Amino acid sequence: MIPLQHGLILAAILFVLGLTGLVIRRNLLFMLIGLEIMINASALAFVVAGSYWGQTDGQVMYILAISLAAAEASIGLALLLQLHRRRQNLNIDSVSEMRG
C-alpha cells in the first residue's frame, strides 16, 4: 500500500542531498561521503522499483550498486590516503595545478 512515488521521492531527496554534500565541501573525505550517499540513494531507488514490480531485478541491481560502491570507496580512500600522505591536507581546491 506504500506508493511508489513516495519511495522515489525519498531516493531523489537523498540523491540531491548527497550531490549537495559532494559540491559544497572542500574536504575530499566529505565528497567521498557524498558520493556514497548518491550511490546508496540510487540503490534505494532501484530497490523500490524492483519491489513495485515484484521482481528480484531491483535487489540484483542493488547488489551490483553496492559492489561498485565498495570498490569505489576503496579506490577513493586510497587516493585520499596518498593525498594526505604527500600533501598533509585534504583541500581539493589545492590540487588544481592542471588548468587551461
Binding site: 550531490l19 581539493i92 588544481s96 587551461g100
Partner: protein
C-alpha cells in the same frame, strides 16, 4: 583608403571572433574539481529541464 584591404579584415572578423570565443571558453577549465561537479549538476539540470519543456 583601400590600401589596408577592408574586405580582408571583414572576412578576418570571424577569426578574431573564434579566438575571443575560445579564450572565453577556456576560463571554464580552471582545474577545480568542485567546479567540475557543479558543471555536471548544471548540465543535469539543463538536460532535464529541456527534456521536460520539449515533452
Amino acid at each position: 583608403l583601400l590600401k589596408r584591404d577592408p574586405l580582408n579584415s571583414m572576412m578576418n572578423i570571424p577569426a578574431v571572433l573564434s579566438r575571443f570565443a575560445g579564450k572565453g571558453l577556456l576560463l571554464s577549465e580552471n582545474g577545480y574539481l568542485r567546479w567540475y561537479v557543479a558543471s555536471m549538476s548544471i548540465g543535469a539540470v539543463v538536460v532535464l529541464a529541456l527534456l521536460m519543456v520539449l515533452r
